[PDB]
Design a protein around this ligand. Structure first.
Ligand code: MG
Ligand code: MG
Ligand code: MG
Ligand code: MG
Ligand code: MG
Ligand code: MG
Ligand code: MG
Ligand code: MG
Ligand code: MG
Ligand code: MG
Ligand code: MG
Ligand code: MG
Ligand code: MG
Ligand code: MG
Ligand code: MG
Ligand code: MG
Ligand code: MG
Ligand code: MG
Lengths: 117, 234, 68, 252
RNA sequence: AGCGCCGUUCCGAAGGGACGGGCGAUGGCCUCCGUUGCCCUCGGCCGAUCGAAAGGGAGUCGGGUUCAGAUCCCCGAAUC
RNA sequence: CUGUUUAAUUAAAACAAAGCAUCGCGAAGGCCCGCGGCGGGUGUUGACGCGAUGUGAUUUCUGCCCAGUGCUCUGAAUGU
RNA sequence: GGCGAGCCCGAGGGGCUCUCGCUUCUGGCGCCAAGCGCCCGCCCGGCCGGGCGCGACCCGCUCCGGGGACAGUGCCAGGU
C-alpha cells in the first residue's frame, strides 16, 4: 500500500443483506383497496348523463386513495370493456369524480343499460 | 526498433506535473491514530519515573524463546482437555475402583492475585511479568516485591504472547512453583541469568530516569549549533 | 491478593510514580471526546468495590465535565 | 435605560455586511512547495469591481502542479497590471509590479502592499485602496524585518511571509467630495447600515448617555476612559490628547 | 443542573458510485447474454435536508360545446 | 438646498445630510453581543479601513485660560 | 550531481567550506509514463497475452509554520 492521496478515508467494507429470523408482522397486510372497493357509485345527474350519449363516456365516484392507473384497471376488471383514458377531479363535497372514456368499439348506452342506469 | 523513442518528462518546479509520491508522512490521520502516535512520542519526551522505566528494559529474544519452550509444556488445561481429564478420570475410577490414581500435576499458576499470593508466601520459583500492561499500576508493585521476597522475576515482551500458552487473550503474569524431573536443570540455568539481569542489578535500575529524549529535529539543530560553536572556537 | 497493592499504590496519589501516569491519562482523556465507552476500567479494584464484576453486561463509560 | 445605538452592532440582526454581491475574499496562494522553493507562472484573466471594496480585484489563474487542473485565485490588483501580464510568484521570483514574493528576497526600500502578518495567512496588512507598506532593516540571523505601515506604525515581522510589489490600485479616492447625500447613500448601502448618524446630543436621555436637557449640550466630559463599561464609551474613547493637532504625531 | 442551546465547516474515518481487468458463482436460447461476491484503478463533499403558486425551469395552439367548464370535454392540427 | 419626522392636534427654525474637525486600534487589537465554549458581529474586513463623538454648504474667521472637573503619559519615584 | 563557480594545498586529487540547479520577451500546451531491466501461460530456440522494480534517492519521532510555560481557563483578594 502506497497511500497517494493526503486524505485518509474509510475502507469500503462489507455490509450484510438483511436476513431476519422471523417475519415481524405475521402476514402481508392485505390490500383493502381491491376492485369492488375502488369504484363506489355510478352517477345519474343530468350533466353526467348527457356525457353518456354525447361523448361515449362514463362517470363514477371513486375513493380518494385510488389513482388513475388503478381506476383504469378496475373498470376493465369489473365491466370487461376497454378504457380510452381517464380524467379525474376532486368533487368539492369530498369524493373523487372520475370520467372514463371508452374505446370507440364499445357503446356507453349499452354499458349503461347493463349496469342499470 | 523503428520509431520507439524515449519521451522523458521533466519534474522540475514550474513545469510538467508531479507524479504520485509515497505521502506516508503527510496524510491527515484521524484522531485515534494521532493519539497513539503522540502518546508514544510523549512517553519518549517526558522523564518517566524509575518505577516504570524498568519496562522497555526486558529480556532478549533468544532467552525469551527458551523460556517459552520451557513454559510451553506446563500448559494449563483448556476446556476440551479439562473435560477429557474429568470424564476420563471418572470413567477410570468407576472401572478400576481406585482411590488416588492421580499422582501430582505440576502446572503453572497465572493471574496477578494468584502470583502475588505465592510470592508473599514464598512458593514461587520464577515470576514472568508481561511488558505491555496499559494500566501500569496493575504491575509496578511486583518488581520491588519480588526483590524483597527473593523470588527471581523476568520482564518479557508481549502480553498477548503469554496468552497463547494460557488459552486466553491477556495473561500479565506467569508463576513457576513446581518443576518436573528433567526441567530442573533448565530452570536453574534460566534463574541464574535472570538473577544476573534483574535482581542483582535492582539498585542500579532503581535510580535510572528513562526517557528525557528530545525530538530528533531539535537534537539535529542543537548539534548543528554545536558544530557552529566548534567553528567559533577552532 | 494484589488488589490491596493496587489500592495502596493508588492511595498516595501525590507521589512521583503515580502522578506521571495521572498526567498522561489527563492529557489522554482531554484529547478525546466528552462521552465514550472505555472497554475496561482504569481503576479495577475501585470500580470493583463499587460493583463491577467483569462479565457480560457491565459497561464502563468515561465522561468529561467542566469545573466551576 | 434603553440600549444605545453602539451596542446593537453586536447583535448582527440588521448590521451584517451586505455580502451577497461580493465575489470572494482577496487572498494570496496558500503557500506550498513551489512558492518556497522556486517560482510559478500565472496569468491575470481580468480585473473586476469588488462591490464595497475600493480596490479593483484581479482574477489570476494558476497551474496546479499536482492535479491536471487550472486553479483560479483572487488577488488585490496592484497598480499597473493589465490582462495578459504574467504574474510571477515564488521565492526567487524577479521583482516587478505584481510579482508577489517573500520579503527576505527584496532589498530595503522596497515598496509593497498586501502582506502577511504571520507567514501563511494569505494577506492581511496594507490592503485598502491606494496604500503601501515599506520594507527596511533586515536581520540575517533570526529572520525578522521592520516595515512601515501606512499609518506610521513601524512593525517587526517574520521574513518568511509574502507580499505583492507596488501599490494597491485606486489611489486618490478621497480626492473627490461625495458632494451630495445620494452617492454616500449608495456607498453605505453597498457596505452596511451605518448612515444617518444622530448626534448623541440630539437623541433622548434613555437612548444615549449624552443627550437630553433643554439645550443641545453634553454637560459631561466627552473623554471617557477605557475601563468604563459597555454603553458608556461614547464620544472620545480614552483620548490621550484632544484639540486640533500639532507636530506630526510623534508617538513612540 | 435541564427541556435544550450554539454552530453550518469549524476539533469529523462524514463517497455504498463508476470504468475496465482478473478470480468465482448463478440463471436464460449455457450460442451467448444477464446478475452477484471479492480484488485492483479512478472519483474535493467548500456538505444532509428545507426555502419563490411574480426569480431559474424542455414541451399546445385554433374551431365548437353547457342552465354552470375550458389552452382540461369534443373535432382537427402539433410538440416534448 | 432636495430629503425625513410626532400614523390619531404640530411638517418646523427640529432631524439627518455633504463638508469640516477630533479620538481608539496593526488582529494575542479596537468597538460590541452572548447564561455558557477562544461562541459569534464588524470580517468574504486591515488605516484612502473599521469603530466613537462634536460641528453642519461655500466665503472669511477659530481669540484667552490646565485653577475646577474629566481624560491621558510616566517612574516599585516614594507615602497609603 | 558538475553542465557548476568558488577559497586553499596540489603532479593528478583532496572536501578544506559551500552555494542548490534544471520555467522570466510573448493571453498556448501539459493527467491516466515513454524508455530501461527481471518473471510467467504462450510459437523450436520464435509468437500472443499478463505481472514487478528503476525512472521519481535513503533514513527519521510531531502535517507545516509562528508563539509558548506565558497568554488564556477555574477559584480567591483589592480597585473601578
Ligand atoms: Mg466486554
Ligand atoms: Mg459627519
Ligand atoms: Mg446630527
Ligand atoms: Mg427631541
Ligand atoms: Mg443613561
Ligand atoms: Mg452650563
Ligand atoms: Mg425547494
Ligand atoms: Mg415562475
Ligand atoms: Mg375550441
Ligand atoms: Mg367561466
Ligand atoms: Mg423613516
Ligand atoms: Mg400637521
Ligand atoms: Mg474582533
Ligand atoms: Mg462651514
Ligand atoms: Mg474655541
Ligand atoms: Mg495638574
Ligand atoms: Mg510545534
Ligand atoms: Mg521561545
Amino acid at each position: 500500500k502506497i497511500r497517494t492521496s493526503p486524505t485518509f478515508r474509510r475502507p469500503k467494507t462489507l455490509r450484510l443483506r438483511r436476513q431476519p429470523k422471523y417475519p415481524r408482522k405475521s402476514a402481508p397486510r392485505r390490500n383493502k383497496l381491491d376492485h369492488y372497493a375502488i369504484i363506489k357509485f355510478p352517477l345519474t345527474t343530468e350533466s353526467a348523463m348527457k356525457k353518456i350519449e354525447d361523448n361515449n363516456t362514463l362517470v363514477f365516484i371513486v375513493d380518494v386513495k385510488a389513482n388513475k392507473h388503478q381506476i383504469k384497471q378496475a373498470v376493465k376488471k369489473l365491466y370487461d370493456i376497454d378504457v380510452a383514458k381517464v380524467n379525474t377531479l376532486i368533487r368539492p363535497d369530498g369524493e373523487k369524480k372520475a370520467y372514463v372514456r371508452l374505446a370507440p368499439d364499445y357503446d356507453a348506452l349499452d354499458v349503461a343499460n347493463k349496469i342499470g342506469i | 526498433n523503428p520509431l520507439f523513442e524515449k519521451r522523458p518528462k521533466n519534474f522540475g518546479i514550474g513545469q510538467d506535473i508531479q507524479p504520485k509520491r509515497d505521502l506516508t508522512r503527510f496524510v491527515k490521520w484521524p484522531r485515534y491514530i494521532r493519539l497513539q502516535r503522540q502518546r508514544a512520542i510523549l512517553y519518549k519526551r517526558l522523564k518517566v519515573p524509575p518505577a516504570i522505566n524498568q519496562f522497555t528494559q526486558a529480556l532478549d529474544r533468544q532467552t525469551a524463546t527458551q523460556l517459552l519452550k520451557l513454559a510451553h509444556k506446563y500448559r494449563p488445561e483448556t476446556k476440551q482437555e479439562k473435560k477429557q481429564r474429568l470424564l476420563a478420570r471418572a470413567e477410570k475410577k468407576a472401572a478400576g475402583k481406585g482411590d488416588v490414581p492421580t499422582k501430582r500435576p505440576p502446572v503453572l499458576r497465572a493471574g496477578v492475585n494468584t502470583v502475588t499470593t505465592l510470592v508473599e508466601n514464598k512458593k514461587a520459583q520464577l515470576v514472568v511479568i508481561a511488558h505491555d500492561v496499559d494500566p501500569i499500576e496493575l504491575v509496578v508493585f511486583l518488581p520491588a516485591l519480588c526483590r524483597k521476597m527473593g523470588v527471581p522475576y523476568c520482564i518479557i515482551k508481549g502480553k498477548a504472547r503469554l496468552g497463547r500458552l494460557v488459552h486466553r487473550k491477556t495473561c500479565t503474569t506467569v508463576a513457576f512453583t513446581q518443576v518436573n524431573s528433567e526441567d530442573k536443570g533448565a530452570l536453574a540455568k534460566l534463574v541464574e541469568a535472570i538473577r544476573t539481569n534483574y535482581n542483582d542489578r535492582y539498585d542500579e535500575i532503581r535510580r535510572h530516569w528513562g526517557g528525557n529524549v528530545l525530538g530528533p529535529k531539535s537534537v539535529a539543530r542543537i548539534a548543528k549549533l554545536e558544530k557552529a560553536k566548534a567553528k567559533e572556537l577552532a | 491478593g494484589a488488589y490491596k497493592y493496587i489500592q495502596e499504590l493508588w492511595r498516595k496519589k501525590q507521589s512521583d510514580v503515580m502522578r506521571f501516569l495521572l498526567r498522561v491519562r489527563c492529557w489522554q482523556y482531554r484529547q478525546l471526546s466528552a462521552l465514550h465507552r472505555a472497554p475496561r476500567p482504569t481503576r479495577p479494584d475501585k470500580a470493583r468495590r463499587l460493583g463491577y464484576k467483569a462479565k457480560q453486561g457491565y459497561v464502563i463509560y468515561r465522561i468529561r465535565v467542566r469545573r466551576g | 435605560g434603553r440600549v444605545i445605538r453602539g451596542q446593537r452592532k453586536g447583535a448582527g440582526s440588521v448590521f451584517r455586511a451586505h455580502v451577497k454581491h461580493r465575489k470572494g475574499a482577496a487572498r494570496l496562494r496558500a503557500v506550498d512547495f513551489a512558492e518556497r522553493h522556486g517560482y510559478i507562472k500565472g496569468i491575470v484573466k481580468d480585473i473586476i469591481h469588488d462591490p464595497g471594496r475600493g480596490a479593483p480585484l484581479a482574477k489570476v489563474v494558476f497551474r496546479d502542479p499536482y492535479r491536471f487542473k487550472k486553479r483560479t485565485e483572487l488577488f488585490i490588483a496592484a497598480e499597473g497590471i493589465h490582462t495578459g501580464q504574467f504574474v510571477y510568484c515564488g521565492k526567487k521570483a524577479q521583482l516587478n509590479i505584481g510579482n508577489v514574493l517573500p520579503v527576505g528576497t527584496m532589498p530595503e526600500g522596497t515598496i509593497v502592499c498586501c502582506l502577511e502578518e504571520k507567514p501563511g495567512d494569505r494577506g492581511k496588512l496594507a490592503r485598502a485602496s491606494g496604500n503601501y507598506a515599506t520594507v527596511i532593516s533586515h536581520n540575517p540571523e533570526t529572520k525578522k524585518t521592520r516595515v512601515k505601515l501606512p499609518s506610521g506604525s513601524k512593525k517587526v515581522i517574520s521574513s518568511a511571509n509574502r507580499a505583492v510589489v507596488g501599490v494597491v490600485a485606486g489611489g486618490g479616492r478621497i480626492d473627490k467630495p461625495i458632494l451630495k447625500a445620494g452617492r454616500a447613500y449608495h456607498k453605505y448601502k453597498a457596505k452596511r447600515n451605518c448612515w444617518p448618524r444622530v448626534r448623541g446630543v440630539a437623541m433622548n436621555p434613555v437612548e444615549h448617555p449624552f443627550g437630553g436637557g433643554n439645550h443641545q449640550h453634553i454637560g459631561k466630559p466627552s473623554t471617557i476612559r477605557r475601563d468604563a463599561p459597555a454603553g458608556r464609551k461614547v464620544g472620545l474613547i480614552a483620548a490621550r490628547r484632544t484639540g486640533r493637532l500639532r507636530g506630526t504625531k510623534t508617538v513612540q
